[PDB]
Write a protein that binds this ligand. Sequence first.
Ligand SMILES: CC(=O)O[C@H]1C(=O)[C@@]2(C)[C@H]([C@H](OC(=O)c3ccccc3)[C@]3(O)C[C@H](OC(=O)[C@H](O)[C@@H](NC(=O)c4ccccc4)c4ccccc4)C(C)=C1C3(C)C)[C@]1(OC(C)=O)CO[C@@H]1C[C@@H]2O
Ligand SMILES: CC(=O)O[C@H]1C(=O)[C@@]2(C)[C@H]([C@H](OC(=O)c3ccccc3)[C@]3(O)C[C@H](OC(=O)[C@H](O)[C@@H](NC(=O)c4ccccc4)c4ccccc4)C(C)=C1C3(C)C)[C@]1(OC(C)=O)CO[C@@H]1C[C@@H]2O
Ligand SMILES: Nc1nc2c(ncn2[C@@H]2O[C@H](COP(=O)(O)OP(=O)(O)OP(=O)(O)O)[C@@H](O)[C@H]2O)c(=O)[nH]1
Ligand SMILES: Nc1nc2c(ncn2[C@@H]2O[C@H](COP(=O)(O)OP(=O)(O)OP(=O)(O)O)[C@@H](O)[C@H]2O)c(=O)[nH]1
Ligand SMILES: Nc1nc2c(ncn2[C@@H]2O[C@H](COP(=O)(O)OP(=O)(O)O)[C@@H](O)[C@H]2O)c(=O)[nH]1
Ligand SMILES: Nc1nc2c(ncn2[C@@H]2O[C@H](COP(=O)(O)OP(=O)(O)O)[C@@H](O)[C@H]2O)c(=O)[nH]1
Ligand SMILES: [Mg+2]
Ligand SMILES: [Mg+2]
Lengths: 426, 426, 426, 426
Amino acid sequence: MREIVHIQAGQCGNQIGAKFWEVISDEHGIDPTGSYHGDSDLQLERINVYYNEAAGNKYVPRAILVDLEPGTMDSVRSGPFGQIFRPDNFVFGQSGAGNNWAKGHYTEGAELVDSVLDVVRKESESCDCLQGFQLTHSLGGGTGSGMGTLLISKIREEYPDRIMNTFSVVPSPKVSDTVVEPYNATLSVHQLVENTDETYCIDNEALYDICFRTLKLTTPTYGDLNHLVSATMSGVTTCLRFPGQLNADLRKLAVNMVPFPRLHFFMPGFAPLTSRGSQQYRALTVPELTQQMFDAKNMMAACDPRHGRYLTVAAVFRGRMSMKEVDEQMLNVQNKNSSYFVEWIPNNVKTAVCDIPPRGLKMSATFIGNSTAIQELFKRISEQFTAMFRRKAFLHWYTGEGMDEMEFTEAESNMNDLVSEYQQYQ
Amino acid sequence: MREIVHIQAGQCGNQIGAKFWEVISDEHGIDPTGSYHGDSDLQLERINVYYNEAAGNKYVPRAILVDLEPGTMDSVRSGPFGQIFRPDNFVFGQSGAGNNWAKGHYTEGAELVDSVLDVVRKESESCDCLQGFQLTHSLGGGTGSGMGTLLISKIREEYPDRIMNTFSVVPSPKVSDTVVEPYNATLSVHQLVENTDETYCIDNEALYDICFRTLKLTTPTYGDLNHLVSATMSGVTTCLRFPGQLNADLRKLAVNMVPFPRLHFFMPGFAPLTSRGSQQYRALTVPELTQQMFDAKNMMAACDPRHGRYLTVAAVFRGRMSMKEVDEQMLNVQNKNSSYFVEWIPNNVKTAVCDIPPRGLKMSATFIGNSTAIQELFKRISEQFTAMFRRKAFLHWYTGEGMDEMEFTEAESNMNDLVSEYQQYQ
Amino acid sequence: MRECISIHVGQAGVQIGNACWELYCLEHGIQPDGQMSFNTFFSETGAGKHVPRAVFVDLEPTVIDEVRTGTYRQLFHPEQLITGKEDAANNYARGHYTIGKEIIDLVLDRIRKLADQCTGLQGFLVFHSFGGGTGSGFTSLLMERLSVDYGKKSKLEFSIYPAPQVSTAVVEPYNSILTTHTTLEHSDCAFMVDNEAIYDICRRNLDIERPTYTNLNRLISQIVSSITASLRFDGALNVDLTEFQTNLVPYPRIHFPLATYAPVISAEKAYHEQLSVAEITNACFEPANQMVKCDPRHGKYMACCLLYRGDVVPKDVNAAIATIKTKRTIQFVDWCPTGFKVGINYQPPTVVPGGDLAKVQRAVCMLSNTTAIAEAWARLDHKFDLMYAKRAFVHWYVGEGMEEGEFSEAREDMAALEKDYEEVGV
Amino acid sequence: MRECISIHVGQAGVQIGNACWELYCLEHGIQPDGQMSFNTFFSETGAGKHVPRAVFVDLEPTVIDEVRTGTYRQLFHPEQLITGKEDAANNYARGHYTIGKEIIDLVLDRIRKLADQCTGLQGFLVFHSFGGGTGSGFTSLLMERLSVDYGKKSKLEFSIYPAPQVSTAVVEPYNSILTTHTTLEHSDCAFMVDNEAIYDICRRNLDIERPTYTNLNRLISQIVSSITASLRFDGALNVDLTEFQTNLVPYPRIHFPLATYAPVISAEKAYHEQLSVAEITNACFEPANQMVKCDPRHGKYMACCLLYRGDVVPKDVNAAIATIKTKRTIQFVDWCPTGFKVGINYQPPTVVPGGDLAKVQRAVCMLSNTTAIAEAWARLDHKFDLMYAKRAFVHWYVGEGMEEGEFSEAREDMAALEKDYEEVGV
Ligand SMILES: CC(=O)O[C@H]1C(=O)[C@@]2(C)[C@H]([C@H](OC(=O)c3ccccc3)[C@]3(O)C[C@H](OC(=O)[C@H](O)[C@@H](NC(=O)c4ccccc4)c4ccccc4)C(C)=C1C3(C)C)[C@]1(OC(C)=O)CO[C@@H]1C[C@@H]2O
Ligand SMILES: CC(=O)O[C@H]1C(=O)[C@@]2(C)[C@H]([C@H](OC(=O)c3ccccc3)[C@]3(O)C[C@H](OC(=O)[C@H](O)[C@@H](NC(=O)c4ccccc4)c4ccccc4)C(C)=C1C3(C)C)[C@]1(OC(C)=O)CO[C@@H]1C[C@@H]2O
Ligand SMILES: Nc1nc2c(ncn2[C@@H]2O[C@H](COP(=O)(O)OP(=O)(O)OP(=O)(O)O)[C@@H](O)[C@H]2O)c(=O)[nH]1
Ligand SMILES: Nc1nc2c(ncn2[C@@H]2O[C@H](COP(=O)(O)OP(=O)(O)OP(=O)(O)O)[C@@H](O)[C@H]2O)c(=O)[nH]1
Ligand SMILES: Nc1nc2c(ncn2[C@@H]2O[C@H](COP(=O)(O)OP(=O)(O)O)[C@@H](O)[C@H]2O)c(=O)[nH]1
Ligand SMILES: Nc1nc2c(ncn2[C@@H]2O[C@H](COP(=O)(O)OP(=O)(O)O)[C@@H](O)[C@H]2O)c(=O)[nH]1
Ligand SMILES: [Mg+2]
Ligand SMILES: [Mg+2]
């Protein structure tokens, strides 16, 4: 039961997603030929959650690859795990998106979306029991932002009772990567607030910081950054695919992390995070892992958590460990740093546990924080957007596709309301 | 229980500390790979006091290496035992200290100190029960003096109920090693008087004298001098790490050696101290060892003890010996030289005993004297400082970093008060 | 796939195009024959050959006659190479009105035919000169026709600007203004250089004592290649022509990028040099290394795009950008904080044998819109006024269908543009 | 790491620099090509080569032309080697005002670029002459510019003093005074020699009958190496450039060290000699072995630093220092009792093949500030007065932007300096 439909939209989303699949395939003992070569029955028990089986023990991701240009997907295909995907699951155009939400959402994306939806429908029909949908995008481009938003809207209309979660790569205010970034992000978020149950917010700045400080990486590759994201993603759904002492459903996580409908933007984190060299100075305790997880240097969103408070935190631990030990340690953390934990919620954290480590570790953990601090990120984007709008800069590219000032204003109002809500529950 | 946090600051402090670790590692059967290869269960019983254990029976000093330039620490790393340290415990800058207390305490040191403090905090959190902090510095430089003083202040603010002890290498008036030495020393001591519970005062002149006269060493290396200091240091904490007939805590030693809050500057000594050749003319009795310990030639501070009186003396003996014999011998010493023992304190000495010799000796002892004579050292530094101040010599280097004449005057006043106190209890 | 069309018009453009084609051939592995995302610039035949997706026009036969006897000859298919009878005679009014309205139709038909090969016709490339007779009016006419036909499709102009000090033609000033009058309301993006700057670069960075057209053209070709390679090749953070339009056109009228390419380094100067990413970025932002006579300190960069090639890391690039932002001298516009697009391609630039440049692992093309360029426009206007006051060299133009008020209108338009720039700056 | 920059200005400086670079190459193991804390003086390329962290300036092309054809040629990267058109003409007023304010900017830019390689930019080295036209005004200008830019950074001048008796130029006296006027309020430390003393040394200690520039330069290079090696190499009791500033600058205006290097021994005289540490120290303190015409008995040493190299023991050095102190002839200042800094490096000095000096296991560089040097200053002032009384050779200076009162002001400053020295002595 509880099978998940995977969608990658736009370049970022697609490349991250490739790595995600690679990771998970390795985890479940699936080789690039789609054959299983694992050593445990636990490895196949719940393989249904991500994969479909075909004749000759072939396994196929229930994955959809979407793009408005071919190059990215061609590269994916050429790649190592690219040949595992069912070829009819590549849905793509040829006309470019110009980092333009309007092209993705209104015009070129509108032309392709129905074909995507049909494939989605088939996958849904092939499910014993559909749990939900996982999307990968950027916030700042045209495809992931415009097309991605579009797709989510249509899927929620069709499956309004199912879980909708996104791993969304967001702008980092100190190092912008595109000129229209604020426009694309604000337009996207305006619709993500309404049409997703959870969004995991990653900013590349934070990843770079992680790479430099802890992993001792002078030269991060996008591949390595994607690996980090992939690990988080895998961690999130471990308890759907494996046993445990205390188990976590996706829906249960949402319930534990969402006190109000709108506040579902999470900062993910991971542990352990060290170099090949700074590991022998450490032992692997639950305490150690928790310390790592609550270290600002191990956050993947662009905030100091101390510039705010955690409303709710979910930790998912993997490996054999004492529940007593874990709970006690978390209680100690709560006691000693009580000011960073909103007082409305007794037992500020949720813990989940999986009786199964990821290959080559004894223990691991993945962290999901919902903090009032993340308002700062929203503020920065709103300010950036606002200045450009004040001068109607770059606007002709969007007005030419039918978009109107009022819509833009609405988006800004939404953003401001979001931040106000965070302020209220500071 | 009773675990100790080790800090080395400045060049002197760092190089001495390396040797200290080397000595102690040998003592506890820890090889340069961080593995234990000892022959006794006593060797590991209290290894916690200096070391943390990691996966794969790796042991790691709870040690922090601090410097404002990289060279010294790089050399440490390159050295034999350098690879035992956890790499994240090296905290260092690149901008030099110019033998300038102001650079260490106010400016360049201020930039680095918070990062050091965070590591200190982690070590504290990793302790079952923190006993105290051990620091190694020079008095006459910029890093050990300025940065070192700074660090101590911050740690006492955070851990005001814990033991703070320093091994501080001080100037020798007959052979100054730097031009601003008096400035650096006086500025340091001004803060050490207030923020340390005990300071072991070593001057290189005395060490050289030891080397020449007793060890028959024509050519002392800094390594050998550091060894001597290291042996004292090891001796001081032996009874925290091992069994005994009558045992000594660090706190207990402080209580026994400190009649008034300010008077905590000790002259360390050691026994046996002979050559490879002048040993076969000797046997190893408690009497012999005591004779050695009270020989002026075996003192490591720049004083004639006969130019004053001992307020209190602590002797720590290692090896199997009759308590009766020891006590009797010390009583005889007291009787025969009663003029050098202040009459306020019956039983002028404390004895401690460890039922465990240091490798390759049957018996050893370490001596801690608190003498009114040491006032002379303070006098010499005060005079040296004073003359230069009279002409405001070298002062622009310090005033340029914000320091003021009044502070300097205060320092001098403190020094003079110290000496007056010693005079009072002569 | 995403695929392109090339147009080279006027002598200068044709010359540039030759070099460009050579470069392309060297890169993708194509011979002089056609023997061996390569299809953006090369359509395949039945076998062996590949045909440059190109068009070559000049009213002087002698230019294209040269092409037809050179080594690069049977690469081209004679359908493309069009020739006239009598040349444009450095006269817009012959290029647009008289001889233009005759052979333009043929060229249009050819273009249409070529398009009917492109499934994904991304757009065009036009190479000309604000300064040739052919390139000033004919180009404009062609642009107009293209707009009439397609409209939505992507259009680029590589425009050789009039160098403020150095004259070539006598009526360079009129021609340029006329071109501006007509091209401005069609071509969404124009990438511009001048020769003076290139000469300067050759003198200083390459140590070349003889400024000539071939080497200069090669430089431009390199830039072109850099611009393209995002379509032509793989890489994280890819780019589309439409993305440039979106990114570098804040207001629809202001669309005149400058260009620059670093490193510009000889055989010797490559050694005695590391060539880091940050260094390269710094070089790109240097006042002298710009490819036009325009001090970037005399204004503000509105929107900037940077197209890094070969061995590059994103984090490094980000760091470099941060550093640049930190520099207070290089001013940006108040209202656009996010004024960077990052483009990264795993293909490194490859240089043509018997040329200026040496091998460089990493390079950048930087494309920027500024308030500072307005000075050049002003200068041009002044020049136009000075010679329009006398009304000299007007009897060439009047004869081939012209009016006096047209010039005035053009001047007014220029003034308006200047005003707009000023407003933007404010 | 702690890293440095080298500047060699004027013919003399350039010549010195050549020798220095050769010495460095011989020491660290670098070829004429660049093939093989080494990074204080050599930045690495992509591969193979190493680039001297250097700058070479002279307005005479002929000096640097020589460099550009010598064996040491492709070691240097031609970015560094700058040349002028017309020389300084032994005229401060051309070096500072006229031709100085033209190419200085370029040099500054180069320096900035070089700095942008240094993570830990310790400081600079400037080699010139109180006596060249280039080296008197241009140097000053450069210093001023550096002060304006950095200020906090460490700055050194190696200054070839005018020999009291032996003339070279006709207007050596004016130039020197002008330099003093401007450099004095910027450069924190200046290390000085004269040629006469060096010649004397060559005659007596080395038995060399022919005084020439190459061998002389080599001596200076050795001194430079000795000064540096604390940064360049390991050793107990290490030294920083900032330490020199702290140690050898009592009052901010008085900062003119003398230098000396012992042993200065030929091939024969090395035998019939032991070369002990104490002996070497004694030699260093000898009246004749000083590198300037200044009797150290005619005043008092304020602050002294001694940089021992190779096989050395600290105790021995201390003993030597004690002995020196005991000697009643060698006077010290009343108010500074601690007037020694000890520097010890395990690297022994290595001498250039085809040169003056032989192998010596132990050597010293001694850097001292005294009241005795004032005599030289007085002599210089007298000289200036004698020729300013006539106002001869003034028509060179007036023409390139000068005033009569400037000279008077300079004289006043000199007088003030003399007075200060006298006060210090008292
Ligand atoms: C000798 C040893 O123990 O090596 C470790 C190791 O040194 C460290 C540093 C690993 C290493 O990870 C990285 O260096 C890294 C690189 C890019 C992106 C992210 C991380 C390791 O490469 C990663 C590798 O991770 C796994 O094997 C997990 O199963 C992990 N797998 C992958 O990400 C993966 C990589 C390539 C191909 C297929 C899968 C995983 C994590 C979560 C969910 C699923 C899988 C491990 C433990 C190690 C190495 C090998 C050095 C660390 O990472 C992980 C994900 O475990 C980095 O910090 C942790 C701590 C580990 O101790
Ligand atoms: C044949 C024999 O008995 O040799 C002795 C010896 O001859 C003498 C002279 C040793 C020797 O010590 C020295 O010569 C020395 C050198 C540098 C600095 C200080 C001392 C000895 O080297 C030192 C060595 O010391 C130890 O083994 C202790 O455990 C000591 N260890 C170290 O300092 C150490 C050295 C190298 C590597 C690792 C550790 C120790 C002392 C206190 C706390 C912990 C450890 C001993 C007894 C000897 C020799 C070997 C000759 C003496 O020193 C010590 C520390 O015991 C010097 O005076 C004593 C008296 C000893 O009898
Ligand atoms: N880069 C480059 N620029 C050129 C070249 N030839 C001419 N130009 C520039 O182009 C302008 C003159 O226009 P041309 O292209 O020669 O004229 P044309 O387009 O052939 O038009 P007509 O000759 O008048 O029919 C001037 O600004 C020249 O500097 C060349 O070979 N390379
Ligand atoms: N040690 C050393 N000193 C030199 C050398 N050449 C000149 N000097 C000294 O430098 C002073 C003359 O200055 P130069 O450096 O020759 O003059 P310059 O800096 O080249 O300036 P101009 O030639 O006037 O442009 C005199 O005091 C010389 O003794 C040399 O090769 N070695
Ligand atoms: N982690 C990661 N981020 C990316 C990658 N490619 C682009 N991005 C980020 O995604 C944003 C740009 O959107 P992008 O997906 O390229 O535009 P699209 O192709 O129109 O959807 C920027 O913030 C980039 O830093 C990638 O491969 N990995
Ligand atoms: N025992 C010992 N003393 C040292 C060593 N290095 C320096 N000293 C002494 O420390 C004092 C100088 O301070 P130093 O630590 O070098 O300056 P810093 O590096 O700025 O802290 C002088 O009294 C030196 O004799 C060493 O390696 N061992
Ligand atoms: Mg032509
Ligand atoms: Mg000269």
